[PDB]
């Protein structure tokens, strides 16, 4: 709804949104692995040499 | 693979002193308990004495016929024995070693100590010489 002969103060490096969405994200990320395997098992000694290939 | 680096023989008279060592590699010493003996050409097998790591005291055993003449201390940094002889006999011509126990408990699971693979090495140096 272009509010015509309006002009505001816009600032970014202030935004809170910008704060909001980074929370948002990391927090959804952290939510999709709360149902996987973790991987502690395998914390173990791994002899290892190159590929032959 | 372990090993125990011998080193420091040398040609010596009863009047004088040396010093036998051994470094290890693979091995550290932060908990190995070391013991050297010591066979003398046509002789049988004569414990000198033991050390045990400075982690459990740094407590010292020593064989009465060698006591007090030849001595066993530890570096602690770069893992190397030492055996430390001084004003000896016609008597101590020999070979020495020095000897430890590897052991090694490989455990299948960090919730029971239960089952595991246990493996035992007798590590040897290579042995170096006391002369009169
Ligand atoms: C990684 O090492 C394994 C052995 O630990 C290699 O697998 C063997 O390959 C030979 C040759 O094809 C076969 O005869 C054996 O039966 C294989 N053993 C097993 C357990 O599969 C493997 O090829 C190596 N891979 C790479 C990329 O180097």
């Known amino acids: 709804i272009h509010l015509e002969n309006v002009t505001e103060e816009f600032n970014m490096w202030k935004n809170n949104m910008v704060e909001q969405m980074h929370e948002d994200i990391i927090s959804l990320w952290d939510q999709s692995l709360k149902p996987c395997v973790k991987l502690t098992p395998l914390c173990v000694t791994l002899q290892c040499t190159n590929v032959t290939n | 693979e372990v090993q125990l680096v011998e080193s420091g023989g040398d040609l010596v008279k009863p009047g004088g002193s040396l010093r036998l060592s051994c470094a290890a590699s693979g091995f550290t010493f932060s908990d190995a308990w070391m013991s050297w003996v010591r066979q003398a050409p046509g002789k049988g097998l004569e414990w000198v004495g033991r050390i045990k790591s400075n982690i459990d005291g740094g407590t010292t055993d020593y064989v009465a016929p060698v006591k007090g003449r030849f001595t066993i201390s530890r570096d602690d940094s770069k893992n190397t024995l030492y055996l430390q002889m001084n004003s000896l006999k016609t008597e101590d011509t020999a070979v020495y070693y020095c000897?430890?126990?590897?052991?090694?408990?490989?455990?299948?699971?960090?919730?029971?100590?239960?089952?595991?693979?246990?493996?035992?090495?007798?590590?040897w140096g290579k042995g170096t010489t006391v002369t009169v």
């Open positions: 000897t430890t126990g590897v052991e090694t408990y490989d455990f299948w699971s960090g919730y029971d100590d239960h089952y595991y693979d246990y493996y035992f090495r007798d590590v």
